[model samples]
Target: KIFGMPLPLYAFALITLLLSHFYNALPTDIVGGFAIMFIIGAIFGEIGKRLPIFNKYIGGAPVMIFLVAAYFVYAGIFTQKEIDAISNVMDKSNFLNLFIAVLITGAILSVNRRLLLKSLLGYIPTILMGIVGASIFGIAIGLVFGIPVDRIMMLYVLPIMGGGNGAGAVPLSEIYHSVTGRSREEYYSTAIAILTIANIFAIVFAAVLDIIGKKHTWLSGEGELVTHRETAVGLVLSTTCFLLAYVVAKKILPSIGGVAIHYFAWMVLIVAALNASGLCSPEIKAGAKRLSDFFSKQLLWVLMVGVGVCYTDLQEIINAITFANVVIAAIIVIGAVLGAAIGGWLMGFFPIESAITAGLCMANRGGSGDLEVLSACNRMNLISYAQISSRLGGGIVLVIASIVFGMMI
Candidate 1:
């Protein structure tokens, strides 16, 4: 049975296929969005999970869902109208935001207070180490290819480690223009393409990290940050936190030193503070966790489809592929994993958990990238830390970029 259906997997697939024939008649809002995404995600997810080398080595179902969905779009399997419906749900309706908020709220509130505080304190330094590793590895690879240090740092290293598109490449491009008197478009186009390549490496490596964790148990938390075992008002609490984040991001503080503070970042801080202060009761925390579990476990595949069809650009990734570009990107991702793993070990946390959050999360494409990396590694419990990597970690890169661009350009 699949998707909790009583029918056999083949039977379920057949039924979904039949339903998809009438896709043009379906509503273009949430209803159609859910229908199409669930169908695509379910089929691909099942296939991916059951495959041998793919499931074991690649990112499995989550990776397959997004990649296939991107191919479907590239191949024109879905018409523009159908794509619009999916995008409407994922982007315009803000389902991605809802997914992230729920996960962050639950993950933060359910953690043991001491572990939560300790992890937060040590995470920033771990992220910096990830940056150091990326720069060193990126430069090393670039040198082998006869690429200059300045070009590698500005074009490849910074963009790959700068978070994601909106929070990372976009702003960095603007900074590049302001400093170098070049067009933002000139820098953004190449940076985004390079970032996309690094994102793929990050996701694939995350799955590899999970395998390494399985072999060396000491290196991994196995999805739990603390040794101790530990939310329904969870939905309410998460949404409330998201609302506060929106206010802070859009109005209260907005940008600091020209770097925009994302709503998810504020949500992480708010939830962390709530957990630190011991304000939430056990039941409330449990409720929140339950909500998070439901979304992460049941709906992750669906989100993958939306992310693929709506956000992923297969052409951009394809265009960026060259031996030198691929090698440099891979090196940067490896550097992030190694750097964060060592830094986390020093901080008394599991190396796998640290690498996945401080390393892969920093290297991927912001919020959606965090979900993809965590899901691939089976570490949904660390969503809050992933957000910290994407939001705060990305912001830090921007601050550094402001200086780097001015000096280097």
Candidate 2:
């Protein structure tokens, strides 16, 4: 059975793939998008889970689905039209935003209110420590390769530690141009490649942390942020909050002091506030939690396909490959992990949970990047904290980038 489908049903999906290819009848809409993503995600996701070493160490179904899909694009197996179809579902239709919004709402609502407030209070500090760790490790590697400290901080540390593409490298590049009078493209081309490399490292390391969590039970919550146990219309409440966040970000107040605040960030705060105020009833919380669980557990692999086809750029990774670049990127990710682990431990949180949410999330490519890292670690429950790292933590980096660019240039 594939994805719990009976043999005939699985065969039907395969037939659909063939028929779609035979007639060139795939529509560039949600219908075709879900069909293609589910079929491809199921095939490779199963293989990734069953593969021996890869399943254990290389990030299993999520990583496998991503790499294979990107490879399909790179190898011309997916024509431009096919790519456009998937991209339309992922981006033009805004499926990614819906997916994240649902998860964020559900995760926050389901958590214990006391624990939620405590974690939020400590999370920003953990994120800062992660940046510090990335700086130290990245700079050390750069110096070993005869690169200067300033260059390492500007080129390697900020981009990888900056959250993700839209909220991280893209804006940082604009700041770099404004400060140095250089072209944004020049900074972005290099920043994006480095960020991509670090993102892969972050995903793989998250897998490693999962294995470690299994071996050392004391270090992790086993996907739960706290030892406490916890959660459907769940979709209605979640989507309502998401809509509020969207309007606030786009219309009410988009940027504060020049750093753009993503709707996801606002959503995180809104849900957390609601949770803290005891405004959402237990039934509502349960429903939101159920909605979150349905999407995160069942549809994650399908989302991975969209992330791979729409977001990942294999060409950038290929162009950025160098012994020094790879080594530096690895160091930065490792630094974030170590920093968050220690900081989280000090802040009364589980080390593994802290590292994944506060550290790896910051180093990754943002929304989809957060999903990839958390999926690798089998920690989808931590999506709320991951959003905090990607959105709020990322905004902090942008603010710092504004100051750092002016000073360094």
Candidate 3:
């Protein structure tokens, strides 16, 4: 049984999605679509978890779900018509946006108020160090490779560390378009292709850091971020916070607005503020933990498949793994890790944990990446701080990109 559901029940969900897709009987109904998503997602997730090398070092189920889905598209296992059908369904549903918001909401709410406040004082600086380190190291490596530093920073490093695509590449591309009058698609596509490669590196970095942490206790916290234990109350409280943040994001869209900034960042800020101010009660926190647990344990696998179908292009993904690209991606990934570790250590945190949570989390594909990194690190509990790095830390990168774009213009 997974997440309290019998394996057979999940199998049924998987078979239902497969048979329906094979018969072209997919439903346009949002609920029906989601049901299909979760079912197939769970199957991919379970297989990923059980698979050999994939289960141990990589992101396990999430990675497998995404790759398998992408392969299905690439290998003609799923035709363009079918791909489009599912892709359109996912987009129209705003599936990822919903998942991101809910995940952030739960992460923030689940934090121990005191611990959060303490981390806030120290963590922001860690993010800065990470940003600076990644930029400097990435640009230096690009120069060595005879690649333009500007291209490296703007096109490659920016998006890789920009907090996944939506919060990272999409907005950065918009900013780039405004500055250069060039095709946003060119910049956008470049960022997208590089990010997938960076994601793989980030997962590898998390795994490496996890192994290192085990070897040297001084370098790691071993994933311990908070003292709070799970309780039944966390589930409902976290759910309540998500609804509240969603409403706020919608309400403020008109006033604050658009590409550079998004509702998820606002959700992070609002949730963080509430917890830091001690306005959220312990019951709410407990409930929030429960909700986060649900997202991590159950929904994450399903969403990984959604991410694969919606975002990944297997051809482009394969191309991104070329030797030169891998080397560049490695420099950026390692630089970010080194930068965060230095920053975190200076701020009185363990290097490995900092590298994984602050550095690698920023490098990974936002929420999905954070889950994978933390899970790999056995530090699943540190998710609150990880989101801060991804959401707020990524937001910082966006702000910097706008300024840089403006300067270029």
Candidate 4:
């Protein structure tokens, strides 16, 4: 189906999300339900402009999509024969392919340098650990494995991104479903739904909390503080250059820390090559900027939607997931909040200023990141989709906690 149902592209997502719940099409699974990126981003970017909490993370849309994607996958909802036939039709729909291709390319090329710096890849964590090493003869092993491996490494920067969990759900469903070797669309749509829901709740809850925060003094107000514009740009350039360098250095040095340097160095070389090739000029900057904006905004959203549409079946999740389902969902949601409180409070007493920190910890734990973790870990077949399912089962409870937290503080 085209993005728009009765009208244009963007309008399609709006209509679909509104009707998804009504038609019993909500995809509540972890990976399947993450498609909420479209619904949350669209609505919040427009209507929830003044809300800071809304700007912080993913919504429930992608979560819904992940649910949809999983329903079929786990249940063997679609036969391989059926999937092949549909895929053939999709292949014939060259328009969809072209659009998906464009979206993927845009995602890769845009590269958020600033986000990368703030992410775990910056080696700041390692550097800190090194300092600790000198203090206590400490020997602890905290291994972080990535997938596609580098996919997680690159994407897990700083604190996720503005699109947040919903967007993460998009990429997760796209990658994980491919791993399952099925062509079913249901699991994908479920992912989108969850992400969408998270975003919507983020805005609504954020607004509610903002009112409470001002009244009760939980937070002075956080969203209006862009904090850094030129700094963000400078950080972006430095991150890119250094990471490219790391990528290069890794190959020669064959060391863990140097891999990022190699990546950084290679990127610098590409820029230098372009400049030396004589195609570099003022126009190049303008063109690159235009491309960047598209990737950062429209391209990112649409690919997320495309990932959603590829597995459309929001109607299914609502029809399923019952009382027993609610119990399972509770574990993950309550577990997360409880975990956040414990972790956030401890982390808080040290460098934390915002009373909202504990609450905000619920932020990026959305669908996309969860799915990537799930998919990457499962790549070696060491785990199943069990944890992700547990998450979906706990979705409603988690939302309630988040929404209440959102309203309260």
Candidate 5:
């Protein structure tokens, strides 16, 4: 019960959003774009449920909402000018990352500390398998797609899998540039688009994997990523921790050697340490649950629509679309899932749990991608491990690329 309000009342607000064009009815500069998304999203969220293939994969409001919005822009329903205007609102709004920060914070705190200790031993190997499996798939598919396999593995697949744009694509661009004397500009847009689209597919496949886990029953962690309880004050503590982690990563981490660090990773490590130490207060846990619930359930879809608008480019996706390309994308993501499962099982961990945390997380778009994949699978509590995949797993990919890209040439 939030502030004495029944949880059922929370359902009413989301229901009312579907009934009203609430965000779209407002000025576009205001929340109009969001309103359009809520209305249209609710509509497809309904239709997708009844469709055959989409029922399992894309039935959710979040997945359908993002695709529908991207389709509208791609179909020329809006002019380039209109698209840019909406993009402006989305960019200035600064929406998605904040939700990621809060949800991951609370989710980690909610975990059972005992399991956190057990997971540490096998986690790194699970991440390594995800990258290894993804690379293997990239090598095979690049050949089928008519690119020389080595070129595609080094140039395209590895970069997208490295992290998101900053940790992944930018450094990759520099590496490729150093070897080939080509500008990063030539590769940046395409790499970013692949990363973004792959992220969307990762969310889709995560939902698929989740369903498979449920049906099999023997495979899953069953959505219990950790064992922390709820407290209202913990939400505020989570918020404070998220911001503080960022401040430290941004301001303090570079004091030594200008080496960049991912703040979300630092946030995950910090919160997990505090919770595992049993140092946090009960009130702090309460607040974190409150905050995490609000953002994860209510706000995630709203921000997803904005992401659909700003990051995705339909024509860019179309140009790259081919049977081979589609298969390649699918294989890399699935390989990550399968590889992590195999690796984790060998390491005495549950396959489903490792797949979600290591495979799906590594295959996703960094921090925001981590949130999307986990949320789609209804496994938000596994976020600490997910962050590790994005930050540490991704870091390993860069290291491999630097050494391998030179030799592959």
Candidate 6:
């Protein structure tokens, strides 16, 4: 271990996040990692609350900040190729570039001020509630699945609450596999399966919540804002913009990083200028809404479906599913339910408007949910992947359930 103890993984993660902070803009790359770390801290804190010895040593977030800052200093000293490899963990300077495809779809539908607002209200709260609901589902379903209730709840709740999906999925994969002593492949497979279905529901429930919340009130402004272009033209424009965003964020940002201090500055400046100027104008606002909706639909849906395919290899190994499996399933369900309930309850504590913003932002940023399934496969691990995949799947479901629950009601 790094400090004469047993925590080498902590050092690796710190390096990844540190490289993220200096290389990218605004610490966006570190966000997913931070989210995960935050939850772990919170959970460990829970343990500390009960114990006398461990509590004092673990302390709080200062440790995290110090670790993050230190890693950046150390990783910066690595060779060019090494830094490039770590940067590949995520391309944060331009991840949103792909949404241009959805914006093209917006070209056909006119933008309206009213419609945009409606869409936001519809999706944001719904995502929160749906995720929370599914967390409750995890709590409930764990009973049937034979997963441990407390651990499942920890898997279900901590990610969205602190890390979102990536942080949650990665850790969940590790913990589940370790406890069950399953093969890596098995756990990862389960992680993918669970994340896929859950992600699907995230989008679907968002739509449902919007419908339930809508009172007709035709969105004349939103329609008008989209500029009534041909869907073909819109698609072209959307693709162009997305590509531009990506290219600019990537090629342009990195080249300037030597003098610029932060590569992401340009992106933040551009999006900010666009947003600050009310460049969303009425139509732009409408277009953004449509794009968001499309993301909630097509993009996330495709991602989920691919997620489902990850478990194809799982069919071969199981000898016989039994009562322990049943117990595990039960734990998964119960844990999910409790997570959703508690998370939603906390959100409810916020003012309606701020809570809405928090929900929407949270839904926007789940890690690709493929981490466990893909990583396990890459490592040639088996059983562990399956066990982890299930938890990952549950985490995705939690995202959707939280979103839907908040919006629909």
Best by lDDT: 2
Cα-lDDT of candidate 6:
0.34
RMSD per model, one decimal: 3.1, 2.9, 4.3, 15.7, 5.0, 21.1
What is the C-alpha lDDT profile of model 4 across 1-409, one tens digit per residue? 2222233766766667556545545433322233444453354334323345433223233233333333444455534433333333334432232332222222222343343333223222222221122111111111112123222111121112112333234434444444444442554444344433332233234334444435654432322110234323433443443444455555654233311122322443444443344443444334444443444345333233333334334454354334332232222222333333333334322111111122222322333332222221111010111111122212322222233223323
For this target, which candidate reaches the highest TM-score against the unseen true structure? Answer: 2
Worst 10 residues of 3 by lDDT: 254-263
Q: What TM-score does structure 6 among the candidates reach?
A: 0.33
What's the distance in Å from true for residue 19, model 3?
3.1
Q: TM-score for each prediction?
A: 0.93, 0.95, 0.82, 0.31, 0.82, 0.33
lDDT of 5 by residue, 159-241 (tens): 66777767788887888788777888777766776776677788888898888888888787787432334444665566677
lDDT digits (tens) for residues 249-348 of candidate 3: 6674522532333455556667777777777677666666666667667677666666667666778878667787888887888888999899888888
Tens-place lDDT per residue, model 2, 83-107, is: 8888998899988888888898888
**Runs in model 5 lying further than 4 Å from the true structure:** 1-37, 49-53, 57-59, 76-90, 144-147, 225-235, 254-260, 277-279
Q: What residue pairs are clashing in model 2? A: 164-365, 232-287, 234-287
Residue pairs of candidate 1 with colliding backbone atoms: 231-285, 231-286, 231-287, 231-288, 231-289, 232-287, 234-288
Ten contiguous residues with the weakest lDDT in model 5: 18-27
Between the candidate structures 1 and 4, which one is better when assessed by lDDT?
1
Distance (Å) between predicted and true CA of 78, model 2? 1.3
Model 1 C-alpha lDDT per residue in residues 100-192, reported as the tens digit of each score: 999989888877777666667788999998889888888898999999898888999889888799888888888898889989988998999
Instruction: Please list the residue runs of candidate 4 whose C-alpha ends up more than 4 Å from where it truly belongs after superposition.
Output: 1-217, 220-304, 311-320, 341-345, 348-409
Lowest lDDT block of 10, candidate 4 = 377-386
lDDT-wise, the better of 2 and 6 is 2
